[PDB]
Amino acid sequence: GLSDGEWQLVLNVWGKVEADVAGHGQEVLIRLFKGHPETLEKFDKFKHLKSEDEMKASEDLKKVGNTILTALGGILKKKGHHEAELTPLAQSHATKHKIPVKYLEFISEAIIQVLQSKHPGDFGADAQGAMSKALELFRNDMAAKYKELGFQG
Numbered sequence: 001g002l003s004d005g006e007w008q009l010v011l012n013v014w015g016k017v018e019a020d021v022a023g024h025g026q027e028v029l030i031r032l033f034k035g036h037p038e039t040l041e042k043f044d045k046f047k048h049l050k051s052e053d054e055m056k057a058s059e060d061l062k063k064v065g066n067t068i069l070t071a072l073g074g075i076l077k078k079k080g081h082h083e084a085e086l087t088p089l090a091q092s093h094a095t096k097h098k099i100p101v102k103y104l105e106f107i108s109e110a111i112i113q114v115l116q117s118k119h120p121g122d123f124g125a126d127a128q129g130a131m132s133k134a135l136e137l138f139r140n141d142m143a144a145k146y147k148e149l150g151f152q153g
């Protein structure tokens, strides 16, 4: 738990992503693949993208980024009561996309780096701490769902 105050700062920076989900989505995926290249491999629509310029042109990359931030936004609005939204995600990432929990941590950092790059005036010391805590809470519930699905906790 975040205090109500903290959920509020979280929802407030999230409003900036909602004004351009696909643009922030694409940037988060390019930041992720540039910082942890190995994450690239879980994505078969893109194991063939060779440069930032190919990533920037990829229509599928933009759509997947979009899909990913749309689902994150939906969890976030639940404000910690996202049990129901989380389950299907843990089911699919655990057994099908097979994503290790550390990759959830790399994506969290990429999300923060994009927020920080694109909205510095709105992403102060406050909004920063609230957003990390919200992403952290998300990581921990996922890991717990993994553990309970009998996976690599």
Ligand code: HEM
Pocket: 039, 040, 042, 043, 044, 045, 064, 067, 068, 069, 071, 072, 088, 089, 092, 093, 097, 099, 103, 104, 107
């Ligand atoms: C913010 C954390 C994440 C959220 C909210 C999220 C959400 C989603 C959603 C909603 C889908 C579509 C339905 C499904 O398969 O479940 C999806 C697909 C997928 N995600 Fe995740 N995801 C997250 C993190 C990641 C990470 C870190 C990776 C890999 C490093 C990943 C890899 C994939 C793959 C491979 C697919 C299938 C994509 C495709 O259509 O080609 N996701 N994700």
